[PDB]
Structures are given as C-alpha cells and as structure tokens.
Amino acid sequence: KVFGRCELAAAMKRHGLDNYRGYSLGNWVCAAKFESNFNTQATNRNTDGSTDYGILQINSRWWCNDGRTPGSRNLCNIPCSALLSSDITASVNCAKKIVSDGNGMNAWVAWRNRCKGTDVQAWIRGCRL
C-alpha cells in the first residue's frame, strides 16, 4: 500500500507514534516518506546483504527475519515480510522497539539525513489527526 501523507500520519498516530520517545508525529511521517515514499512494500538491499523492509525500511540485519541475512538478528521477532503489510502495525511496533533502543530515530538513515533538524511538523500539516 502507498499511504497518503495524512493517512499515514493518522495511522501512525492511532498506533501511538505521536511523541513516542519524544518524536513528534511529523518525524515518523518524514521518516516514512524518505525511507519508503510511504510504500509499505518497499524493499531495498543493503551493502551487507541485509534488506530493508516496508514503510520504515526496517532492516533484516537486526530487526526482522527474512531468511537470507545470515548472522543477523530478528529483534522485532517478526518475518520481514510482515513489515510489508498494508497494515502498519508490525512496522510500527518494530519501530517502537528500534527507537527505544537508545539511538532514537537516528536508526533511520533517511530520517537523520532528511528529517532531523528540519521542520518535521510540516509533514503533518493540514492533516486531520
């Protein structure tokens, strides 16, 4: 599924991401925009052979099992394919674990490079939330 911006904002809000670990909702929407262009089916392969999955491009090196990232962890205890669902629950729940892990949203490269330090509230501007 390719979410609309506000649709995703609302979904993320419903799933408890607004101000989760101090990260306002726009951070999460911004991260999703730049990680996946709001596409739950996005996958990208990393240089180490892991793959990033879903709307928040959560990687299989650490967070999910895709059966083809040897030596990796599955800290969200999910098949990576669950992160491709049109239902963002698995991604959100995993993202909550990630962002809680001490590094905040810096885990999301695109967030660090494209959202951090910007007016992320713009990403939820105009949305009914």
Ligand X SMILES: CC(=O)N[C@@H]1[C@@H](O)[C@H](O[C@@H]2O[C@H](CO)[C@@H](O)[C@H](O)[C@H]2NC(C)=O)[C@@H](CO)O[C@@H]1O
Whole-angstrom distance, CA of residue 84 vs CA of residue 91: 8
Give the count of alpha carbons within 13 A of 75, CB side only. 14
- Pick one of Cl ion, ligand X, Na ion, none as the site partner of residue 24 (Cβ within 5 to 8 A by kind): Cl ion
- Pick one of Cl ion, Na ion, ligand X, none as the site partner of residue 46 (Cβ within 5 to 8 A by kind): ligand X
According to the annotation, is 66 in a ligand binding site?
A: no
- Confirm if 59 and 53 have CB atoms less than 8 A apart: yes
Q: Which of residues 19-48 bind ligand X (CB under 6 A)?
A: 35, 46-48
* Closest C-alpha to 94, from 107, 109, 76, 80: 76
Nearer to Cl ion, 25 or 31 (CB): 25
β partners of residue 58: 53
Check binding of 79 to Cl ion (CB under 5 A): no
Is 87 an annotated catalytic residue?
no
Nearer to Na ion, 24 or 74 (CB): 74
Check binding of 75 to ligand X (CB under 6 A): no
Whole-angstrom distance, CA of residue 23 vs CA of residue 118: 13
- Interface residues with Cl ion (CB under 5 A) are 11, 24-26, 69, 87-88, 104, 121
